[PDB]
């Protein structure tokens, strides 16, 4: 299956009962000007590149 | 007298003293050639300050090092600091400023420890454990 790439443009906060899940907003490389918010599992900064296995799943917040 | 310079380097308790003077290109550590330094795998740590700036600079000089303290690994890092420091102090006193600056730029851009010592030192033990932070095991039943 295809895989799409996106670029973190902001880090919103932290979630999970124990803080191991940061929340980010991203900008897709191809077809930019589409942004999605989703959760990540390890340390992360601005300008990082994330490989998204499925593009269209916007992620919920525990608070 | 012939031009001379004395410098030193340290890592943990290891210390090495490098006497440097105008000569023919000798580089001996502990009264032996630099080619016989042990442990073998880390020979290129001692060779590094020479290679990085070319062997040319070392042709007109004699360098004699001596090491004490620490252990097998920490001594090697003391030697490499002394050799780099000796060359910079020699160019300070007997060549010119520019040469010292450009030399220093090469040494620093590769590895800072070649010239500035490592500030880390060991932590004391604290009663109640086998180490500075570790503790004995606790039990409740």
């Amino acid at each position: 299956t295809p895989v799409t790439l996106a670029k973190v443009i902001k880090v919103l906060g932290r979630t999970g009962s124990r803080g191991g899940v940061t929340q980010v907003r991203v900008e897709f490389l191809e077809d930019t000007s589409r942004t999605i918010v989703r959760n990540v599992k390890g340390p992360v900064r601005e300008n990082d590149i994330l490989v998204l296995m499925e593009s269209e799943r916007e992620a919920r917040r525990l608070r | 007298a012939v031009p001379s310079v004395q410098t030193f380097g340290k890592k943990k308790s290891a210390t090495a003293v490098a006497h440097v003077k105008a000569g023919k290109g000798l580089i001996k550590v502990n009264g032996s050639p630099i080619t016989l330094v042990e442990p073998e795998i880390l020979r290129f740590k001692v060779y590094e300050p020479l290679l990085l700036v070319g062997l040319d600079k070392f042709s007109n000089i004699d360098i004699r090092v001596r090491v004490t303290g620490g252990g097998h690994v920490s001594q090697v890092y003391a030697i490499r600091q002394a050799i780099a420091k000796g060359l910079v102090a020699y160019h300070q006193k007997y060549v010119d400023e520019q040469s010292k600056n450009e030399l220093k730029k090469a040494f620093t851009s590769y590895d800072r420890t070649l010239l500035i010592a490592d500030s880390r030192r060991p932590e004391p033990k604290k009663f109640g454990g086998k180490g500075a932070r570790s503790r004995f095991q606790k039990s409740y039943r």
Binding site: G42, D48, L50, M53 | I41, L51
Partner: protein, 205 residues
């Protein structure tokens, strides 16, 4: 041209004045791996000699990303108690292992190590989530730095477990592990584990 001194420096050790080679055999100009996401977290642009630097990387959050990758693979072989420390064995085991890769594949050995990293970092993982104590799994994305971290751990855990109670040496089992993973072969411990994590993740979206 070669220079001679009062102390002779062998000719095997004099060509390096033009370019730094790892273990004085392998070059760095030709190492580049195409995973666009992982460039800023694999360090192959500062050539070094001996893979024994003694740097400080545990004082700030992301300083470890600047450590050259060969040394971060060395670090992970010093494991399971009786081998903690003993970095001089790790440097020797990686000197042998890089050598075996070149013989077995006629290819740059460092570039093979890089490819093994970029084909093992799982892309999607799962997290425990619940309320009041009852829990379940939920899918999340995995960050670039952690992709490299969990890559190295898998490559060296499999190589350590494959050699234990075996006739083959550690430098060999690690050599086989790195060769297969970079090929994308399901024989590797690293690749099989990756697919187990990503299969679970898809089922818990």
């Amino acid at each position: 041209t070669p220079v001679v001194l009062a102390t002779p420096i062998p000719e095997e050790v004099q060509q390096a004045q033009t370019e730094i080679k790892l273990f004085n055999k392998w070059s760095f100009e030709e190492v580049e791996v195409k995973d666009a996401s992982l460039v800023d977290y694999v360090q192959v642009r500062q050539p070094i000699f001996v893979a024994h630097t003694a740097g400080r990387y545990a004082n700030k959050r992301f300083r470890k990303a600047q450590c050259p990758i060969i040394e971060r693979l060395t670090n992970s072989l010093m494991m399971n108690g009786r081998n903690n420390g003993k970095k001089l064995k790790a440097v020797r085991i990686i000197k042998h292992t890089l050598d075996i890769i070149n013989v077995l594949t006629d290819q740059n050995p460092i570039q093979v190590v890089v490819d093994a990293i970029t084909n093992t970092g799982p892309r999607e993982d799962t997290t425990r989530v619940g309320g009041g104590g009852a829990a379940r799994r939920q899918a999340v994305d995995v960050s670039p730095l952690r992709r490299v971290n969990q890559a190295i751990a898998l490559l060296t855990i499999g190589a350590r477990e494959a050699a234990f109670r075996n006739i083959k040496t550690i430098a060999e089992t690690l050599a086989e592990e790195l060769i297969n993973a970079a090929k994308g072969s399901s024989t590797s411990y690293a690749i099989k584990k990756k697919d187990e994590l990503e299969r679970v993740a898809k089922s818990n979206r």
